[PDB]
Amino acid sequence: EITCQENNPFTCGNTDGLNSSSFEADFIFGVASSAYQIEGTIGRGLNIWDGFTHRYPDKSGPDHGNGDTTCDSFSYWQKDIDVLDELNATGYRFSIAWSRIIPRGKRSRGVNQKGIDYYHGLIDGLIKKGITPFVTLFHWDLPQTLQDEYEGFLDPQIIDDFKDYADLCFEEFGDSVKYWLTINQLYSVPTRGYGSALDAPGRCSPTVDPSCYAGNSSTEPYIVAHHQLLAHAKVVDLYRKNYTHQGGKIGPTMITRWFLPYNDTDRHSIAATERMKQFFLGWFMGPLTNGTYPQIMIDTVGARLPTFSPEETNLVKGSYDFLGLNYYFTQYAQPSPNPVNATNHTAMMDAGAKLTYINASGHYIGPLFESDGGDGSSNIYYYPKGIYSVMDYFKNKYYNPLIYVTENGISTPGSENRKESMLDYTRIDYLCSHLCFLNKVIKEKDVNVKGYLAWALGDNYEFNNGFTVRFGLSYINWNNVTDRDLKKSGQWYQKFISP
Amino acid sequence: EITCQENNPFTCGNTDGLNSSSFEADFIFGVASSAYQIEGTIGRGLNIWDGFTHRYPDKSGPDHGNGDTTCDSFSYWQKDIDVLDELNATGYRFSIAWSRIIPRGKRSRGVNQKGIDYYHGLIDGLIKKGITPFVTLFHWDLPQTLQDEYEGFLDPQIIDDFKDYADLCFEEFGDSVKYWLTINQLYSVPTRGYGSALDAPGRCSPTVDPSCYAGNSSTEPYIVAHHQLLAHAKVVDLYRKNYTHQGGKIGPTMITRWFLPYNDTDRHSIAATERMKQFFLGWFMGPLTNGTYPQIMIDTVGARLPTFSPEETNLVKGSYDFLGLNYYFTQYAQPSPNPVNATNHTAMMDAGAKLTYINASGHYIGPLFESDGGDGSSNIYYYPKGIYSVMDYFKNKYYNPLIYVTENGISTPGSENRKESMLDYTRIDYLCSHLCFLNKVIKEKDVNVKGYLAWALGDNYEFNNGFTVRFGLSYINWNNVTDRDLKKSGQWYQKFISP
Numbered sequence: 001e002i003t004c005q006e007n008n009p010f011t012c013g014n015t016d017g018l019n020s021s022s023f024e025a026d027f028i029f030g031v032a033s034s035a036y037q038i039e040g041t042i043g044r045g046l047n048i049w050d051g052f053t054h055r056y057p058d059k060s061g062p063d064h065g066n067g068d069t070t071c072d073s074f075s076y077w078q079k080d081i082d083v084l085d086e087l088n089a090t091g092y093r094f095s096i097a098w099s100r101i102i103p104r105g106k107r108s109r110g111v112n113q114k115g116i117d118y119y120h121g122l123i124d125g126l127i128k129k130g131i132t133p134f135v136t137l138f139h140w141d142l143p144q145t146l147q148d149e150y151e152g153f154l155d156p157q158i159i160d161d162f163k164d165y166a167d168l169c170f171e172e173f174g175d176s177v178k179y180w181l182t183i184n185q186l187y188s189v190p191t192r193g194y195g196s197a198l199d200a201p202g203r204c205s206p207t208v209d210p211s212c213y214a215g216n217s218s219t220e221p222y223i224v225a226h227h228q229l230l231a232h233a234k235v236v237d238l239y240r241k242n243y244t245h246q247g248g249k250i251g252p253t254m255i256t257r258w259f260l261p262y263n264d265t266d267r268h269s270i271a272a273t274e275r276m277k278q279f280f281l282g283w284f285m286g287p288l289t290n291g292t293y294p295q296i297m298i299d300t301v302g303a304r305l306p307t308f309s310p311e312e313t314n315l316v317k318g319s320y321d322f323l324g325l326n327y328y329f330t331q332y333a334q335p336s337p338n339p340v341n342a343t344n345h346t347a348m349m350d351a352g353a354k355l356t357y358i359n360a361s362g363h364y365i366g367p368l369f370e371s372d373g374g375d376g377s378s379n380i381y382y383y384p385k386g387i388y389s390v391m392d393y394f395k396n397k398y399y400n401p402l403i404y405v406t407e408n409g410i411s412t413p414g415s416e417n418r419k420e421s422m423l424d425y426t427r428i429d430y431l432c433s434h435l436c437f438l439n440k441v442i443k444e445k446d447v448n449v450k451g452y453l454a455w456a457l458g459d460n461y462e463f464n465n466g467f468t469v470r471f472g473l474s475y476i477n478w479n480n481v482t483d484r485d486l487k488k489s490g491q492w493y494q495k496f497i498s499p
Numbered sequence: 500e501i502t503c504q505e506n507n508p509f510t511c512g513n514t515d516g517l518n519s520s521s522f523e524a525d526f527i528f529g530v531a532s533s534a535y536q537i538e539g540t541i542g543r544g545l546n547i548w549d550g551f552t553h554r555y556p557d558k559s560g561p562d563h564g565n566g567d568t569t570c571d572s573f574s575y576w577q578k579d580i581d582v583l584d585e586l587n588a589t590g591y592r593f594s595i596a597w598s599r600i601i602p603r604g605k606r607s608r609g610v611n612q613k614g615i616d617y618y619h620g621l622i623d624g625l626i627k628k629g630i631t632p633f634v635t636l637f638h639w640d641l642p643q644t645l646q647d648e649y650e651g652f653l654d655p656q657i658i659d660d661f662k663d664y665a666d667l668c669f670e671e672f673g674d675s676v677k678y679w680l681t682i683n684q685l686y687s688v689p690t691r692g693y694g695s696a697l698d699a700p701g702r703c704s705p706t707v708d709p710s711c712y713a714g715n716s717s718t719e720p721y722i723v724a725h726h727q728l729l730a731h732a733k734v735v736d737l738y739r740k741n742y743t744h745q746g747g748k749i750g751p752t753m754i755t756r757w758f759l760p761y762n763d764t765d766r767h768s769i770a771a772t773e774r775m776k777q778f779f780l781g782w783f784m785g786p787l788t789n790g791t792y793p794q795i796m797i798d799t800v801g802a803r804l805p806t807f808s809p810e811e812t813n814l815v816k817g818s819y820d821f822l823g824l825n826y827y828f829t830q831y832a833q834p835s836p837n838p839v840n841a842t843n844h845t846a847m848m849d850a851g852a853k854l855t856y857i858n859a860s861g862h863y864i865g866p867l868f869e870s871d872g873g874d875g876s877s878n879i880y881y882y883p884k885g886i887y888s889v890m891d892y893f894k895n896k897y898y899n900p901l902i903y904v905t906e907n908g909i910s911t912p913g914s915e916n917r918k919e920s921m922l923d924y925t926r927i928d929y930l931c932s933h934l935c936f937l938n939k940v941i942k943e944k945d946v947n948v949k950g951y952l953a954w955a956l957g958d959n960y961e962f963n964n965g966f967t968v969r970f971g972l973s974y975i976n977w978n979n980v981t982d983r984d985l986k987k988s989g990q991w992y993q994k995f996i997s998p
């Protein structure tokens with residue numbers, strides 16, 4: 001009988017009690033990163049995260065930082081492999097920057113052979129060290145040219161451009177890469193990129209944010225989500241029909257959260273909680289498992305929800321070999337009005353829920369996850385049991401998928417100095433408390449989870465936050481980015497992996 | 500009888516001896532700038548100077564600096580007007596960033612109303628202070644989307660996109676702007692952007708520079724120059740046929756240089772010198788005045804030189820109301836082989852000339868213009884009489900045009916500290932020695948020069964040099980860019996203008 005802690009203090013940092021041996025022999029342990037966040041712009045074309053951060057610098061982060069040079073994994077990819085080697089990691093999730101290998105967006109315009117070599121050297125070097133690549137095709141960094149030609153995922157033209165790009169990756173790397181992710185966190189771009197405009201490309205309704213250059217927060221998140229699902233499904237079909245000889249697997253990435261009722265004896269809060277599961281998870285998992293959106297979405301969103309043709313439904317349904325599930329935290333849900341007529345309406349209001357980290361009787365859901373200066377009431381708190389509830393829900397509701405936890409991690413303030421940043425005990429607590437529950441749900445519920453990749457390999461540019469927070473298990477000095485030094489969390493993880 | 504100095508020490512800094520009164524009453528005096536160099540990326544789309552500097556940071560400058568924030572004239576445009584107001588300037592040349600008003604390149608994709616407002620506020624504020632705007636439509640900062648769609652000026656598609664962009668500028672600003680420049684320094688993009696790849700977009704033959712992503716140094720400079728002339732001519736035709744009610748004038752900008760024989764008694768060096776005038780100036784001025792390239796270009800460049808149809812010739816010939824002539828320095832010319840078969844052949848070798856600042860008998864042509872660390876022999880030297888020889892040549896050879904000197908200035912090292920940077924006596928010497936000759940050629944040769952705009956209003960990102968050199972008549976502290984403080988040169992110029 002496995003017992004896991006939900007509340008500080010945690011004791012799962014002791015590798016006597018919890019380590020990789022607790023898991024099956026073949027279970028993959030590693031870390032993750034993404035191209036925009038680590039590589040730098042050297043050697044690649046420009047993408048909408050360059051566009052967005054440069055046009056709207058106050059949305060790139062409070063320090064206006066961006067991915068221009070960041071930790072320069074373009075130059076220092078070997079140092080990233082050295083961190084993985086030191087961890088004795090068996091997996092590394094990284095993304096290919098579309099702009100690095102097809103700077104002009106559309107493949108017929110030519111490929112950047114040097115960009116293709118960069119990823120060949122990286123993939124080799126990982127394989128030389130026994131590290132299994134999990135490669136994300138699209139971690140949000142859409143070539144700027146496509147956003148300017150037809151507004152990227154707002155237009156069905158993205159489907160063939162994304163397909164041709166994916167085809168080049170499979171052809172160039174698929175002999176060595178056996179685990180592909182199509183689109184990172186399906187929920188994020190539609191909502192943050194086209195709904196609240198916190199993220200690239202930064203489209204939204206005029207009264208949601210006057211700085212958006214265009215958009216409609218009420219309709220575009222549904223259009224973009226729909227094209228994501230079709231583009232993803234066309235790539236998975238290309239992969240399974242044309243690259244089956246490579247003997248690899250492909251899946252989408254979901255951002256997952258669990259949801260609990262803000263008041264667990266109030267039927268309206270219970271209803272809001274189940275609506276959140278459908279609107280947050282089901283928006284994508286319903287198409288991915290059934291070829292259709294959830295009924296509550298169909299009913300609420302009405303004419304703003306696109307339909308799949310029969311052919312499209314069939315393409316999308318079952319379009320994965322596994323699911324890359326990212327998990328960070330859980331929210332309480334209470335009812336909220338859905339003012340579909342307000343000029344500031346967003347797709348996110350359609351769920352009819354308000355999300356918090358404190359429930360009706362004042363209980364905070366768990367330990368601090370992220371502090372906010374501009375609003376202490378806007379702090380995020382985490383919930384280790386959330387990973388157990390998510391995995392169990394995916395096995396039960398979504399047909400017992402093969403899962404890899406493709407991100408899980410926590411930030412520490414960028415204010416902290418080097419010695420404080422290195423002593424990141426809060427990160428050990430976050431990681432181990434989640435790993436405890438993950439082992440617990442695999443053993444108790446028999447969820448088919450086969451790996452875990454902590455976010456992040458090293459400190460990097462964090463979307464929306466610049467360099468004001470750090471997520472790395474290894475520390476990077478922004479005055480001299482060459483080194484990646486294992487923090488206490490990375491040293492703990494090294495011992496967890498090889499106890 | 501006007502006498503001007505060619506050699507240090509100069510004495511033209513004394514406004515008793517030389518001042519604006521020496522010139523006609525209406526003569527315009529001011530300074531110049533360009534959008535990429537001063538504004539910052541905030542509020543605009545991305546262009547190929549963002550692309551190039553981020554993809555090839557070691558080509559953006561030795562410090563890898565770029566125009567991301569630079570002197571932030573986006574925020575501080577009023578401070579630029581305050582410098583002009585302090586100078587009692589009557590002219591200001593600035594450029595409109597195409598990416599700021601049509602971020603998606605093609606006008607039918609929508610306009611950035613906030614970007615249009617930015618330029619409205621600036622133009623107003625100039626006019627409120629009695630400053631005549633001279634506005635450059637295209638100072639090299641091509642929206643990145645157009646370079647990625649069809650490689651920008653490499654393709655005839657640029658002609659209609661540039662026309663639609665120009666049309667929006669005329670419609671929005673032409674009620675207040677009466678002096679338009681179409682394309683900055685016609686010679687530069689073809690040669691540096693597509694020949695040596697020192698400049699955006701950074702295309703060239705593989706053995707010229709292996710870092711170029713594509714190109715052909717031997718053919719593309721001619722293709723790009725040809726499309727520049729057609730795009731320029733289509734815009735001038737649009738201006739003169741559709742905006743004649745605005746009562747303004749439009750012209751191209753030429754980079755001008757004078758050329759002297761490396762050995763003035765050697766017929767081969769004399770020949771090389773006349774070839775340089777045709778290949779450097781005539782490449783554009785021949786089409787602009789006659790609708791055809793120079794014969795020596797026709798003969799040498801052969802099948803690599805595009806032809807104008809009769810309609811095209813007629814559009815291009817006479818396509819200016821005035822010429823914006825930029826002038827910085829003069830070179831000696833000696834014969835050089837033109838190895839048309841070498842894989843490293845460039846369009847620039849077609850002139851069959853080698854250019855230096857020292858002639859055969861060891862005479863340096865004039866005072867130091869720019870120091871080079873990596874090669875003392877690669878120093879540039881200036882030649883005040885060059886401005887007299889250029890203007891006289893344009894009146895004589897090119898049909899007595901109306902001219903505005905749209906740039907003329909000199910850099911001082913970025914290494915210098917604040918007090919040394921402010922004491923920029925070398926800049927007074929450069930400016931006054933050229934102004935002396937300019938007055939001299941207007942009086943002696945009757946050249947129709949009606950204004951002079953020194954480069955630059957303030958320190959800015961210098962193309963190729965980042966922040967390693969300073970060109971401003973007003974100083975900008977890169978740790979706090981708000982202020983623009985008149986250097987000794989700006990204070991001298993203020994006295995020169997209002998003696």
Ligand SMILES: *[C@@H]1O[C@H](CO)[C@@H](O[C@@H]2O[C@H](CO)[C@@H](O[C@@H]3O[C@H](CO[C@H]4O[C@H](CO)[C@@H](O)[C@H](O)[C@@H]4O)[C@@H](O)[C@H](O[C@H]4O[C@H](CO)[C@@H](O)[C@H](O)[C@@H]4O)[C@@H]3O[C@@H]3OC[C@@H](O)[C@H](O)[C@H]3O)[C@H](O)[C@H]2NC(C)=O)[C@H](O[C@@H]2O[C@@H](C)[C@@H](O)[C@@H](O)[C@@H]2O)[C@H]1NC(C)=O
Pocket residue numbers: 286290291292293294295298299307
């Ligand atoms: C997994 O995918 C399954 C499909 O492969 C889902 O089942 C479908 O669910 C549909 C509802 O979402 C359902 O469609 C409805 O069918 C009604 C009856 O259709 C016939 O009869 C009509 C009159 O006799 C006639 O007009 C038709 O020609 C049919 O012969 C129909 O009235 C419904 O339309 C109304 O409501 C919808 C909103 O749902 C409106 O869009 C529409 O304007 C109208 O107001 C509806 O029809 C659908 O309308 C939209 C159109 O684009 C669709 O093509 C059309 O089908 C459909 O019959 C079933 N299909 C089958 C094979 O079962 C399944 O849904 C879950 O299970 C069903 C039984 C139900 O409980 C759903 O609510 C559940 O979500 C998906 N499963 C999951 C878990 O999501």
Ligand SMILES: *[C@@H]1O[C@H](CO)[C@@H](O[C@@H]2O[C@H](CO)[C@@H](O[C@@H]3O[C@H](CO[C@H]4O[C@H](CO)[C@@H](O)[C@H](O)[C@@H]4O)[C@@H](O)[C@H](O[C@H]4O[C@H](CO)[C@@H](O)[C@H](O)[C@@H]4O)[C@@H]3O[C@@H]3OC[C@@H](O)[C@H](O)[C@H]3O)[C@H](O)[C@H]2NC(C)=O)[C@H](O[C@@H]2O[C@@H](C)[C@@H](O)[C@@H](O)[C@@H]2O)[C@H]1NC(C)=O
Pocket residue numbers: 785789790791792793794797798806
């Ligand atoms: C200002 O613009 C003027 C044009 O509006 C320039 O004058 C033109 O200069 C052309 C030379 O550059 C000249 O064209 C040549 O004409 C030759 C004779 O043409 C007729 O006779 C042929 C046989 O009888 C016949 O095939 C034709 O059908 C004509 O009836 C012709 O042989 C030349 O072609 C050879 O050389 C050219 C290289 O220049 C090659 O391209 C070609 O393969 C061939 O080897 C040449 O013809 C041109 O060929 C290319 C084609 O695209 C052109 O359409 C074709 O014209 C032309 O006659 C004149 N036009 C007139 C009206 O004078 C003027 O040039 C300067 O002045 C001329 C007199 C000469 O001195 C030039 O060298 C000067 O540059 C321009 N001025 C300036 C200052 O640049």
Ligand SMILES: *[C@@H]1O[C@H](CO)[C@@H](O[C@@H]2O[C@H](CO)[C@@H](O[C@@H]3O[C@H](CO)[C@@H](O)[C@H](O)[C@@H]3O[C@@H]3OC[C@@H](O)[C@H](O)[C@H]3O)[C@H](O)[C@H]2NC(C)=O)[C@H](O[C@@H]2O[C@@H](C)[C@@H](O)[C@@H](O)[C@@H]2O)[C@H]1NC(C)=O
Pocket residue numbers: 263264265266267360361
């Ligand atoms: C979690 O949700 C539950 C269920 O909603 C909350 O309990 C309910 O709380 C209501 C007050 O917020 C109770 O209603 C009141 O009943 C009294 C006595 O008859 C009356 O004076 C009030 O006006 C009010 O009556 C309602 O008025 C509006 C009508 O539309 C409605 O039909 C009336 O009932 C309600 O009875 C109670 N329900 C139950 C099943 O307990 C619960 O609230 C917390 O507990 C209750 C017992 C009370 O102490 C609340 O103040 C307290 O906050 C909520 N929990 C938390 C922590 O918020």
Ligand SMILES: *[C@@H]1O[C@H](CO)[C@@H](O[C@@H]2O[C@H](CO)[C@@H](O[C@@H]3O[C@H](CO)[C@@H](O)[C@H](O)[C@@H]3O[C@@H]3OC[C@@H](O)[C@H](O)[C@H]3O)[C@H](O)[C@H]2NC(C)=O)[C@H](O[C@@H]2O[C@@H](C)[C@@H](O)[C@@H](O)[C@@H]2O)[C@H]1NC(C)=O
Pocket residue numbers: 762763764765766859860
């Ligand atoms: C500026 O250009 C002029 C004209 O080209 C230079 O003067 C010429 O310089 C040549 C040497 O560089 C002289 O030719 C030599 O003549 C002697 C005596 O007959 C002979 O011993 C040499 O081999 C050479 O002869 C040539 O060899 C190659 C043949 O194809 C050619 O036909 C032969 O003549 C040449 O006479 C002279 N021309 C004139 C008109 O003066 C000039 O060079 C400078 O001045 C000359 C006088 C001499 O002192 C050079 O060393 C000196 O550099 C050059 N000026 C500069 C500063 O470079």
Ligand SMILES: *[C@@H]1O[C@H](CO)[C@@H](O[C@@H]2O[C@H](CO)[C@@H](O)[C@H](O)[C@H]2NC(C)=O)[C@H](O)[C@H]1NC(C)=O
Pocket residue numbers: 205206215216217218219303304343344
């Ligand atoms: C976002 O787009 C939707 C749909 O195009 C707009 O909502 C429509 O508004 C018009 C005029 O009020 C109505 O006739 C339609 O019934 C509405 N359609 C639906 C599907 O709601 C909405 O106004 C747009 N929002 C903004 C802020 O531009």
Ligand SMILES: *[C@@H]1O[C@H](CO)[C@@H](O[C@@H]2O[C@H](CO)[C@@H](O)[C@H](O)[C@H]2NC(C)=O)[C@H](O)[C@H]1NC(C)=O
Pocket residue numbers: 261262263264265359360361362363
């Ligand atoms: C808010 O969350 C707390 C903690 O999860 C809930 O409190 C638990 O409530 C159940 C019975 O209702 C008890 O068995 C536990 O002992 C309680 N735990 C603690 C730490 O007090 C509380 O019910 C939630 N409130 C609402 C309104 O849903």
Ligand SMILES: *[C@@H]1O[C@H](CO)[C@@H](O[C@@H]2O[C@H](CO)[C@@H](O)[C@H](O)[C@H]2NC(C)=O)[C@H](O)[C@H]1NC(C)=O
Pocket residue numbers: 704705714715716717718802803842843
């Ligand atoms: C640049 O383009 C030119 C023309 O397309 C190339 O030169 C041609 O080379 C081929 C093969 O050697 C010859 O058949 C042609 O006669 C040449 N044309 C001319 C106009 O010179 C040249 O090789 C290209 N350069 C590079 C470096 O790509």
Ligand SMILES: *[C@@H]1O[C@H](CO)[C@@H](O[C@@H]2O[C@H](CO)[C@@H](O)[C@H](O)[C@H]2NC(C)=O)[C@H](O)[C@H]1NC(C)=O
Pocket residue numbers: 760761762763764858859860861862
């Ligand atoms: C190099 O430049 C110098 C300076 O312009 C030239 O020297 C002048 O030559 C003429 C006669 O040839 C004299 O009248 C001047 O007195 C000379 N000036 C000086 C400062 O010496 C020289 O001729 C040029 N050399 C070549 C080979 O062209």
Ligand SMILES: *[C@@H]1O[C@H](CO)[C@@H](O)[C@H](O)[C@H]1NC(C)=O
Pocket residue numbers: 015016017018019020021022499
């Ligand atoms: C790893 O943890 C298990 C419990 O899951 C424990 O029995 C085992 O001894 C630990 N291994 C080491 C090497 O500490």
Ligand SMILES: *[C@@H]1O[C@H](CO)[C@@H](O)[C@H](O)[C@H]1NC(C)=O
Pocket residue numbers: 237238241242
């Ligand atoms: C597989 O490759 C062939 C050859 O290019 C292509 O034409 C075919 O349509 C592809 N199948 C897909 C994309 O499912």
Ligand SMILES: *[C@@H]1O[C@H](CO)[C@@H](O)[C@H](O)[C@H]1NC(C)=O
Pocket residue numbers: 480481482483
């Ligand atoms: C940067 O880091 C590397 C690796 O630690 C070090 O050897 C190098 O000298 C450092 N340079 C500076 C300028 O700190």
Ligand SMILES: *[C@@H]1O[C@H](CO)[C@@H](O)[C@H](O)[C@H]1NC(C)=O
Pocket residue numbers: 088497498
């Ligand atoms: C790496 O992990 C393997 C597999 O558990 C183990 O046998 C090996 O000793 C580990 N190496 C290090 C240096 O920890």
Ligand SMILES: *[C@@H]1O[C@H](CO)[C@@H](O)[C@H](O)[C@H]1NC(C)=O
Pocket residue numbers: 514515516517518519520521998
């Ligand atoms: C300006 O210079 C002229 C010579 O060009 C001189 O005669 C005049 O007095 C000067 N004006 C002033 C105000 O110094």
Ligand SMILES: *[C@@H]1O[C@H](CO)[C@@H](O)[C@H](O)[C@H]1NC(C)=O
Pocket residue numbers: 736737740741
């Ligand atoms: C002038 O404007 C009209 C109206 O748009 C346009 O159709 C016409 O062709 C323009 N003339 C030019 C571009 O010379």
Ligand SMILES: *[C@@H]1O[C@H](CO)[C@@H](O)[C@H](O)[C@H]1NC(C)=O
Pocket residue numbers: 979980981982
């Ligand atoms: C920046 O410059 C402005 C204008 O000189 C000044 O008033 C402001 O306080 C300065 N800020 C800093 C941080 O130097």
Ligand SMILES: *[C@@H]1O[C@H](CO)[C@@H](O)[C@H](O)[C@H]1NC(C)=O
Pocket residue numbers: 587996997
């Ligand atoms: C500005 O120039 C005008 C025109 O020469 C002159 O009359 C006026 O006094 C000048 N103002 C200043 C403050 O120098």
